[PDB]
Amino acid sequence: LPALKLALEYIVPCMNKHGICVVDDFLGKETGQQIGDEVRALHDTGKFTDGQLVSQKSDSSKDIRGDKITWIEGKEPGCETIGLLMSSMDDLIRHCNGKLGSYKINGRTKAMVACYPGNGTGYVRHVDNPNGDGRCVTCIYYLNKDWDAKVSGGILRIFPEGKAQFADIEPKFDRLLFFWSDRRNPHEVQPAYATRYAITVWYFDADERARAKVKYL
Ligand SMILES: O=C(O)CNC(=O)c1nc(Cl)c2ccccc2c1O
Ligand SMILES: [Mn+2]
Numbered sequence: 001l002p003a004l005k006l007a008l009e010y011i012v013p014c015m016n017k018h019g020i021c022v023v024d025d026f027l028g029k030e031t032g033q034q035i036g037d038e039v040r041a042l043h044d045t046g047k048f049t050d051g052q053l054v055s056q057k058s059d060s061s062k063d064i065r066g067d068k069i070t071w072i073e074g075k076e077p078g079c080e081t082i083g084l085l086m087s088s089m090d091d092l093i094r095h096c097n098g099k100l101g102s103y104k105i106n107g108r109t110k111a112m113v114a115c116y117p118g119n120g121t122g123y124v125r126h127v128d129n130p131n132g133d134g135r136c137v138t139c140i141y142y143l144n145k146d147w148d149a150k151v152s153g154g155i156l157r158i159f160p161e162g163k164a165q166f167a168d169i170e171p172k173f174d175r176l177l178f179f180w181s182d183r184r185n186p187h188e189v190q191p192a193y194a195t196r197y198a199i200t201v202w203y204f205d206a207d208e209r210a211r212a213k214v215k216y217l
Pocket of ligand 2: 126127128187
């Protein structure tokens with residue numbers, strides 16, 4: 001679907017109502033597979049970090065590490081398609097101009113590609129932007145084909161503010177996710193028992209970012 005139709009008919013309404021929006025079959029199988037290949041290539045070639053230190057035992061050889069990451073600009077060799085995804089995300093947000101809350105998005109971060117090794121590690125409950133650093137929207141694209149949470153875990157659980165219940169999102173292949181980056185969406189990644197890949201970009205609100213530079217300097 002054209003970025004515009006998706007943004008106007010689904011993304012905008014959903015975000016303003018729930019603060020969370022899931023779009024399946026974003027780029028299609030062919031493009032999705034290419035991004036998956038590039039990401040897997042980055043991993044296999046050692047472009048990722050060793051992973052977040054979860055437990056620091058006395059013996060550093062027993063230390064358990066979690067999610068591995070790598071920042072991607074989208075212009076690097078072998079990351080062309082990742083750049084395409086980023087460009088597609090940008091087009092989508094551009095068409096949401098002035099319709100997502102009262103925000104005015106004028107920029108984004110590079111892409112943060114994350115890999116949960118599948119060794120039982122996840123990500124503790126947290127808020128992406130709890131101190132007003134400018135990030136208003138978190139966008140995540142998943143690349144895990146035939147992912148079955150009942151067997152591999154890795155579910156993204158969001159705890160919507162003021163709502164007793166929570167929203168569980170499986171990291172399904174070619175799935176695109178949007179949610180407010182602030183305290184409205186505390187979330188966690190449940191333990192993953194299979195290699196789990198995701199690509200995240202954060203979009204900045206013009207005003208929040210402008211004044212963030214004042215304090216955080
Ligand atoms: O991957 C997911 O479904 C959800 N991931 C996250 O919420 C998440 N958040 C942050 Cl702030 C980081 C930060 C660093 C590395 C991985 C992260 C991560 O996967
Ligand atoms: Mn997060």
